Amino acid sequence: TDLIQRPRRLRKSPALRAMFEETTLSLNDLVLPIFVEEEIDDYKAVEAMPGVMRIPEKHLAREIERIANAGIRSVMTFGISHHTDETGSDAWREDGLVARMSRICKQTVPEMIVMSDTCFCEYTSHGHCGVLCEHGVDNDATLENLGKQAVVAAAAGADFIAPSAAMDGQVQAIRQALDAAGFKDTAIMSYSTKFASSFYGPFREAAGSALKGDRKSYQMNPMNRREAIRESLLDEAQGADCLMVKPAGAYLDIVRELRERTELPIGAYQVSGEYAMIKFAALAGAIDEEKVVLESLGSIKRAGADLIFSYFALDLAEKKILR
Amino acid sequence: TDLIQRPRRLRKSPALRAMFEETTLSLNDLVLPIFVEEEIDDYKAVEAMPGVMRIPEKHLAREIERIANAGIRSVMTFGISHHTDETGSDAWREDGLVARMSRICKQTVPEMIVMSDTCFCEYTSHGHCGVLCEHGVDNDATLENLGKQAVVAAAAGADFIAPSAAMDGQVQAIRQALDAAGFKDTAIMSYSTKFASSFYGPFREAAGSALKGDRKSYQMNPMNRREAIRESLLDEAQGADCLMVKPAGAYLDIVRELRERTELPIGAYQVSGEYAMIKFAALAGAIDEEKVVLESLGSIKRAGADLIFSYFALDLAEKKILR
Amino acid sequence: TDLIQRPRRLRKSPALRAMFEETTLSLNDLVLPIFVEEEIDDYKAVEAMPGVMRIPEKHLAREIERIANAGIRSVMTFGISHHTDETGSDAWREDGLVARMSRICKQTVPEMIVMSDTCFCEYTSHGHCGVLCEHGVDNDATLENLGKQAVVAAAAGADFIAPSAAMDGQVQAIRQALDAAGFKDTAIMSYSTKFASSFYGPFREAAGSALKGDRKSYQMNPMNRREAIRESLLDEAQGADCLMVKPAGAYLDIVRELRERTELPIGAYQVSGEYAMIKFAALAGAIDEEKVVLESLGSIKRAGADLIFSYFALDLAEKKILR
Amino acid sequence: TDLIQRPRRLRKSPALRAMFEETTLSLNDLVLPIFVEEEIDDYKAVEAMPGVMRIPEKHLAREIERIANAGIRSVMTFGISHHTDETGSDAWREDGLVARMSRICKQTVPEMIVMSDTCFCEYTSHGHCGVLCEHGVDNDATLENLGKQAVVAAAAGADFIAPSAAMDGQVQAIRQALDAAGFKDTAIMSYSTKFASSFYGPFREAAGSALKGDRKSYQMNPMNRREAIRESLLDEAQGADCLMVKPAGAYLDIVRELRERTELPIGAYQVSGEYAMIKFAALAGAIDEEKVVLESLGSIKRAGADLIFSYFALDLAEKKILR
Amino acid sequence: TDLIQRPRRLRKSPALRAMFEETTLSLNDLVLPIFVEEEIDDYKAVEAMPGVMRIPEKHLAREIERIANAGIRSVMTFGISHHTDETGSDAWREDGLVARMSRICKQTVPEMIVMSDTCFCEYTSHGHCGVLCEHGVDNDATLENLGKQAVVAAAAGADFIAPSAAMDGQVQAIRQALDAAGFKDTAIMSYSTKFASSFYGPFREAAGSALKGDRKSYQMNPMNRREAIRESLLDEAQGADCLMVKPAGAYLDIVRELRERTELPIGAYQVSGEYAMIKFAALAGAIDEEKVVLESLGSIKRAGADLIFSYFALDLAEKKILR
Amino acid sequence: TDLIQRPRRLRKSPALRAMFEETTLSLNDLVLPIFVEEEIDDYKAVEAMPGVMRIPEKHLAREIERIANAGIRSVMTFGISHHTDETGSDAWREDGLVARMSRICKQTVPEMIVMSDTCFCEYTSHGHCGVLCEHGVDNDATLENLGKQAVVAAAAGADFIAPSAAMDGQVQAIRQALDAAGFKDTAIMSYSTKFASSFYGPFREAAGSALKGDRKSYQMNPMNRREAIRESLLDEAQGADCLMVKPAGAYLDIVRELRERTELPIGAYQVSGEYAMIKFAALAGAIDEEKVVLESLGSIKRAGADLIFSYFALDLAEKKILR
Numbered sequence A, B, C, D, E, F: 001t002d003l004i005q006r007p008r009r010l011r012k013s014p015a016l017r018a019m020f021e022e023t024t025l026s027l028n029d030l031v032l033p034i035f036v037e038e039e040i041d042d043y044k045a046v047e048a049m050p051g052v053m054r055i056p057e058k059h060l061a062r063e064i065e066r067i068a069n070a071g072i073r074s075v076m077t078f079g080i081s082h083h084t085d086e087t088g089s090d091a092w093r094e095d096g097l098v099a100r101m102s103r104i105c106k107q108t109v110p111e112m113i114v115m116s117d118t119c120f121c122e123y124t125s126h127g128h129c130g131v132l133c134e135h136g137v138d139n140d141a142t143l144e145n146l147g148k149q150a151v152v153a154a155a156a157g158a159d160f161i162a163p164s165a166a167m168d169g170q171v172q173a174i175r176q177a178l179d180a181a182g183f184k185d186t187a188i189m190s191y192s193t194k195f196a197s198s199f200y201g202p203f204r205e206a207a208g209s210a211l212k213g214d215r216k217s218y219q220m221n222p223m224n225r226r227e228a229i230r231e232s233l234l235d236e237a238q239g240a241d242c243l244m245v246k247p248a249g250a251y252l253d254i255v256r257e258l259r260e261r262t263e264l265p266i267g268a269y270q271v272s273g274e275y276a277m278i279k280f281a282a283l284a285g286a287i288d289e290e291k292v293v294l295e296s297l298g299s300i301k302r303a304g305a306d307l308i309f310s311y312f313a314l315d316l317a318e319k320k321i322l323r
């Protein structure tokens, strides 16, 4: 036939394909979510998340050295609480689990980039991301508490305060609180566009989130692309240093759209449900885990993500699959 | 706190959330892929795709009636061949499996829109998508055969000829071929952006594709977003009635970029691999299948797809989960 | 002939057309304007609006249950006043018609989305949308009163306070008033771009608006597309949760232009004159009412409207034409 | 209140509003559709279109003179045939009704710009816009006939050949045809975006279109905005001198999107249905006809139309409402 | 001070800076230019390009093995001719220097991607890029010869034919030529935007280009940014597989503008002059060579280049500075 | 061959090329960086910068007259300090070197445009661009001092205060300080996008900057194009009269991108390392200095720069190469 344009020409050998590959993925693009449980002794496997385990607080100094030695540059701290209550106040206790997780990480590996998850769903008896009032989760009462938690996490050494409470004005609240306390240099990794997804089941199992209803009244609608952009642009306006799309996997259209609407760095969270789905199809022998993980993380980068929160990070690190 | 902008205002209730939902998913958005195996008697279960079975040719009249009864408006045919050879010539035999799958569907259900997968990987002894040469899969030898297959399938009643060979100029070749033989009205549903993905394992099992190596010399690189758009715009230029992104789940950024680059309809294939990861994670009790399937399909719609190829379409239709 | 591109290919059967339909319309997209008259006993037909009737206040609890049972998710309340005066002060009487209409609706169907029309043209002896002063309608005196009305409507349970007075700064005024009174969660459905149209005659008949001149000094010029966009973008800037184009029917260019200029939800009002025109041509046997209604509402959605205010809503609901 | 931006500032008076009016409507924006019935003696009233009458061929010289005297710069001819058949061949008879309507207009008023409707629904026994086949309306059989009709109408003096058959490739066919016969200077006014609307009932009555079914296999879907633009850009590509959206009243979003996609002139047809809804609502005394006609026509201008096809053009011209 | 936005927040440490680095440079981004001199025995040092030497043809098998061992994925061949003449015919001799440089590279290292410089300035007695006429370099006489050279080099194994003659229509000429001779799969790497720069002195020394005058009648003006884009888009239109900007260092604005105007791969040539200025400044001890080379190459990547032609590639590869 | 488009047509003679040259460079586009050393007697050559010399303060009145007489319209003052200390306080001494350099220039040539470099790296014992604190360079303590320096430089007659400290909020700080002191007319030439480049070695030698580490914690990452734009747009937002990209040479993609994102004038700094690289390759006889300088400065203008800071300026001036 007569065809002048032939895409296949640059696909002929592995060398040609390597030369013309548009997107690349490094170990640097990954942030490792870590689960830390206070007052316990043995690491606990998370069933819903094949390979993940809660790290006993007594072993955190050891795991963070392990992670750092594998080449992971950053972690996101999630605690499993034994001092839950109606407001999740242990989260702003200058010495509670949240402060302690940071303290230990920064003390152990000074150069480790410590992002402290900032919410209450893991510290409240009801499992909601804030103060429950007659109304539902109280936005402004929760903003107050998110700010106090911010200051003690910054106090403990957290490099980024990451609000995941899906509260309006949360970035502004945390920025003023940090500044007022002399933490004007502490960064905010906002979970800016965070969907009321059905892919967090494994995570809730892993983190001990005691919730029976849903978070549909704060986390946003999965179907709303316009609203998703506006959620992130409001956070940019309130001073976030980095934005984020959560989940990442089934939202790369949102990542790409946001990429074109801001100059800010954009993070993407490869959530627990996405991890479970790769892990369980691999164990059923349906897919090649490694090929599927690399393709998935590669797609997230291709969509425009600057950083990817991924539970596969340390394995990828240690098995020298990514450098 | 001071906030005039409060996104949560429209999230207060189920009624408010429904009123402001930006994207909708319905049954007419779905196209159901079916596997038909010739010269066989019982339905065969696909191991890697729980719930999916090869339909015996003898029972296709029965199944396409069932499918149609469920509300499914369309199907994509894939045959499992017992007449494979060097060039996959059974596919262009006037009464080969390709032509008969269409014939039995259109004759049983005249209203059923039948899209006929158009390739050779299911009919070649080597498992590759075309004619082999010392070269690798020979582009132009394959184009002639795609043309021949197009006319017999068109003659057999197929409403869409869907070339999935990833051959340069395939749409033009098939357009020229159908036109000359008097099928100027038969449409082309081009797998215009078809990535050399690792998510097709389950499908190859289901369709009996005898491939030992890879398809990287013709299916495109997963990392190449600019190339992906160019791939589809070259097919729009060639006359394609509908364009397509495959896989869809991890390529929503592609679907969205493409939506902004053409006025043509865009299909998105929720591949066997995606189906597999959802089913095994649900079997493992880690996620809720239905909520995860609906979220997954809704995101593909959200990203810009007009039609979605889903192996979940029949259950969603019969269980009246989508109307 | 030789034509590669053939649009007609996807128009061959009802099935194909259904698969390729770009826009859809659900019962969810509709908001039902309701006319409630205090101190009366029998429902009154509105002559200019064939099929519409004023609901006696004593029957409102009954009609709102009827509407809600038909599946309508939201209503817009308009009262016919028997206590008109120079400033329309019954509108901010904590117990006047406006408060009462809301009170009754929310008390009867707690989940009903109650949008309270916010103006004075129905409560003033002169029929103008505010305070008449030497000058004409006094913008700032009217802003004051619009805020007080907002608080009592929010107090009564209105979900959205909908200013239709076409007063500059009305959204800002209503937002500060609501916030100050502890109604920071009450939404604003601004009639942001509201034209000085000649299509409201039937509505004025239906609502008892006692006006002899025009509203050309506040409602904007029908011919000004640039000004129309700016009117809506100013409201976005002042905190509106939802914007609106009124009328909708002969302004879909304005709807589409606004759609591309904001991420906010956009409402469109299918006004009384548009309803009368469909109703009277149908009664003269000139057109098919149902086909024309569905095509018109479908066009409004196609233009970019997220919600449509429509008097045909309950019929469409009950006759199961829309679900 | 504090507001530096007050849109009402330029709305204070009639002089200020006129000075800032963005869009203008004049008589030269209007094209007058006329119905001419052959072999008949008295004017026939169109029931569904009050004020509209079939003009007897014998009286056309008289009427086109009247029209021209009124200031009308152009007309679109529609003939009511007494010579219908299977293929609508009277339309391409050198002296058939199509050719004579043009001839009598150009010869009576040499300056009159005559646009000749170019189709077969008014000349076929079955009422469809072309040649029927087992298929439905045969596209390419019809294109040949459109070509033949184009040359006789061109030869008869028509200034524009306006194909309203909704056939793929109609503009190219008619361009090729006129060119070969030496009418390289005759223009094409393409009904480029012609929707399968329900607003044409009154017109079919007025023009005697013997159709029992629908035109959905060729006129396009009302819901398809992206397809609508593609429809017109394919005609610009084919050489069309002017493009068009029909209907116009409920498709102003289309007109505006198209205005932004081409530098070509764009016509908009205010259809019989729109005319009917305005007239019957005015008869019912529900709206003011003149104010509603002027607003309706002004919105079509506002949306981007260069020319408007209106059945109100003559009254507006004679009553000196437009100059 | 009051500042919510503090860019320095993500600059606090080496880890934070790496995590937020937007652009990456790797070894696969580099293509290594090599100078091969025929009929000679020892390596010759290039004075003006410290570190660069003419490789004796006899030692090419050895060197391409060394290059390939280092990790270099590709080279661009430039031969120093001992058979120059009026038309540069040695270049299209089936076994001329051009064909043999390719042959020895592909045969020694089958995986090596060989791009063959395609011109006549190194083979013509007058030193100009083609056939001379009273005119100056004759465009179309040269195109024929570029075509002839393309096929022998293609036949010899070259993976890319890279026309650097700056002839109008060179890509089409070479595409037509390779196609006819059965090299439809051989690619074209067009020096699409090739400026008449003053930075090529060192290269001419290294490649033995016998030119006394200038190339301004064919290489384009350095000041013309709009012309530069037009130059490359005409080559994309002609079928070029990859486009290119030369020089690259002082034309990063061009590279970036071009990146936004095409989806095609874009190469950028870090010319001999740039290489020379870096080396001599480093020799003079004024700058750090490595830091300056890495910054220079990283900026070309940053600006949008997919591939970079660099004379520093081998040292960077062997010293393991890039992987 | 057949080619309609022939770029070469406008390249045939020097006259044609001159007519079609898109970009031009005048002496007006250049700003001359001057090095002034207090308490010394003989001009000192800067080894790293062939041709540049520190001007003894006692000779400044003489050199500025020389510069002005050559036609240079503006200079950028850099001092070599003999009164360095921990905070660089001599920089805000109403009579220190910074004040004095300006004083002398404006006193000598009243019409000379005096841009005073505003930092501390030349006045601090540690060589950092501000106040060193436990943390690193203290952003806010440095902002304080940058403001005081601004007022005394404005006091001395500087026309532009040019902050090069890469401190967040520096433009805002300097603007408030200037305004408060009655210097609301003094302009700010912000070094808005200033990279942590490896091309400043020669400058540091020339300016006596006593730094042993790097400026990576304030000057921005060379690889971050998105951040580069945001750095400049923040300065526009804080009131800068002119923006700047530094370095210029290997950042013309950044210059072009910024050009398209602001209406503000954009300056570009052809840094010392770029000067050294041209000078040393010219001395090694590798390139033609003049041709390379003119091409480089011409590229900077082509990329979008309105003013270029260049050390070659006075030579270009005196040798009448630029007027």
Ligand SMILES: *[C@H](CCC(=O)O)CC[C@@H](*)CCC(=O)O
Residues within 6 Å of the ligand: A164, A191, A194, A199, A200, A201, A202, A203, A204, A209, A215, A246, A269, A270, A271, A272, A273
């Ligand atoms: C937000 C969502 C948590 C929840 O709603 O339970 C913060 C945690 C994100 C990670 C969830 C996951 O990895 O599934």
Ligand SMILES: *[C@H](CCC(=O)O)CC[C@@H](*)CCC(=O)O
Residues within 6 Å of the ligand: C164, C191, C194, C199, C200, C201, C202, C203, C204, C209, C215, C246, C269, C270, C271, C272, C273
């Ligand atoms: C604004 C216009 C009312 C008026 O000017 O009388 C608020 C009511 C909109 C609906 C009017 C209608 O449906 O005609």
Ligand SMILES: *[C@H](CCC(=O)O)CC[C@@H](*)CCC(=O)O
Residues within 6 Å of the ligand: F164, F191, F194, F199, F200, F201, F202, F203, F204, F209, F215, F246, F269, F270, F271, F272, F273
């Ligand atoms: C900023 C950079 C100076 C440094 O970091 O030493 C202000 C001076 C710019 C000119 C530097 C040069 O010309 O190299």
Ligand SMILES: *[C@H](CCC(=O)O)CC[C@H](*)CCC(=O)O
Residues within 6 Å of the ligand: B164, B191, B194, B199, B200, B201, B202, B203, B204, B209, B215, B246, B269, B270, B271, B272, B273
């Ligand atoms: C594409 C090629 C599939 C393959 O096996 O390479 C055409 C069929 C797409 C379906 C694949 C799937 O569902 O996994």
Ligand SMILES: *[C@H](CCC(=O)O)CC[C@H](*)CCC(=O)O
Residues within 6 Å of the ligand: D164, D191, D194, D199, D200, D201, D202, D203, D204, D209, D215, D246, D269, D270, D271, D272, D273
């Ligand atoms: C389009 C087809 C009309 C039809 O009856 O299908 C060409 C004529 C447009 C005028 C229709 C009207 O005015 O209603």
Ligand SMILES: *[C@H](CCC(=O)O)CC[C@H](*)CCC(=O)O
Residues within 6 Å of the ligand: E164, E191, E194, E199, E200, E201, E202, E203, E204, E209, E215, E246, E269, E270, E271, E272, E273
């Ligand atoms: C372009 C022409 C070079 C010339 O000498 O005119 C093709 C080769 C580019 C390399 C030039 C260099 O590296 O300086």
Ligand SMILES: [Mg+2]
Residues within 6 Å of the ligand: A166, A167, A168, A169, A192, A231, A234, A235, B007
């Ligand atoms: Mg938010």
Ligand SMILES: [Mg+2]
Residues within 6 Å of the ligand: A007, B166, B167, B168, B169, B192, B231, B232, B234, B235
């Ligand atoms: Mg293709």
Ligand SMILES: [Mg+2]
Residues within 6 Å of the ligand: C166, C167, C168, C169, C192, C231, C234, C235, D007
């Ligand atoms: Mg307003």
Ligand SMILES: [Mg+2]
Residues within 6 Å of the ligand: C007, D166, D167, D168, D169, D192, D231, D232, D234, D235
């Ligand atoms: Mg058409």
Ligand SMILES: [Mg+2]
Residues within 6 Å of the ligand: E166, E167, E168, E169, E192, E231, E232, E234, E235, F007
């Ligand atoms: Mg060229």
Ligand SMILES: [Mg+2]
Residues within 6 Å of the ligand: E007, F166, F167, F168, F169, F192, F231, F234, F235
């Ligand atoms: Mg800055």
Ligand SMILES: [Zn+2]
Residues within 6 Å of the ligand: A119, A120, A121, A122, A128, A129, A164, A165
């Ligand atoms: Zn939470």
Ligand SMILES: [Zn+2]
Residues within 6 Å of the ligand: B119, B120, B121, B122, B128, B129, B164, B165
């Ligand atoms: Zn295949």
Ligand SMILES: [Zn+2]
Residues within 6 Å of the ligand: C119, C120, C121, C122, C128, C129, C164, C165
């Ligand atoms: Zn009102």
Ligand SMILES: [Zn+2]
Residues within 6 Å of the ligand: D119, D120, D121, D122, D128, D129, D164, D165
């Ligand atoms: Zn017709």
